[PDB]
Amino acid sequence: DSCIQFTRHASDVLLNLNRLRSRDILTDVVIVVSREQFRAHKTVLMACSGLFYSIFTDQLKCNLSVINLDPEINPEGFCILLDFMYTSRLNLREGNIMAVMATAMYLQMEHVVDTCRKFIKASE
Amino acid sequence: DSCIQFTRHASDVLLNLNRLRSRDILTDVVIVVSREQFRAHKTVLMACSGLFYSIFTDQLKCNLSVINLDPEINPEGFCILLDFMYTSRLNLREGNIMAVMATAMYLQMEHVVDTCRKFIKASE
C-alpha cells in the first residue's frame, strides 16, 4: 500500500497497556502461581505467550477469570516475564536466570528462551 | 535498572493483537459509526485514543458492549484510524485526509491530527 507509519506507535501502545495494568483498568484475568496472584489483560498474555494463546483460544478456558499455573513455576520468574510482556524489558540476573528460562519455556516465549540460553552459554 | 530490551517486542505484540482482531478473538466491543459496525478490543482503543480512554474509564460506560459514535463521523475515516491503531500504518490519501483528520480530532489521536495538518499545509 501507500501508507505512512508512525515509528513510536507500537511502543506507545504497549506503554499505555502497562499504565492500564498498573491502574488495574480492564484487567480480566488473575494468573495464580502458587501463593501469588497476578492481574493482567488476556489479550496481552495471548500476544506474548504460546501457552496463553492456546488457553484463551480454547472454547471453555477463554471464559475463565482465574488460571492456575503448574506448581513448579516460580512466582518471581513469572513476575519478571509479565513485566517483560508489558514493557519489552527483561530483568535477567545471575540469581533468576534459571527460573526465568524455565518459566519462558513453560509459557512458550521463544525470544526470551533464546536470550537465556545465550547468557547461560557465555557463563560456561 | 539493569534490564535488557527486545527491540521488536512492541511491534510483535501489536501484530499479534491485530491477528486476534482479524480472527475476532476476545473482541469485547462494537463501535457503531452510523450504518457500519467495527469490532475491537477496548484496551487497544483506550491505548490509542483519548476519547476511548475517557469512555472506558467511566464507571458506567466501561460495561457497555456497544458504543455509538457521533453521526457526523465518517465510517471510512474511522476504519482507517482503527487499522492505524492496530498496525501503526495510516492510509492517508487526498480523498480521505479531511475525514481522517476530523475523525482523529474527535477520537483525540494527537499524532494523527499532527501529520494530517502537515500534509494539508504542504498542499496549500
Binding site: 505512512i4 507509519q5 515509528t7 | 500504518r89 501529520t115
Partner: peptide, 4 residues
C-alpha cells in the same frame, strides 16, 4: 512518521 516514515515511509515503511
Amino acid at each position: 512518521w516514515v515511509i515503511p
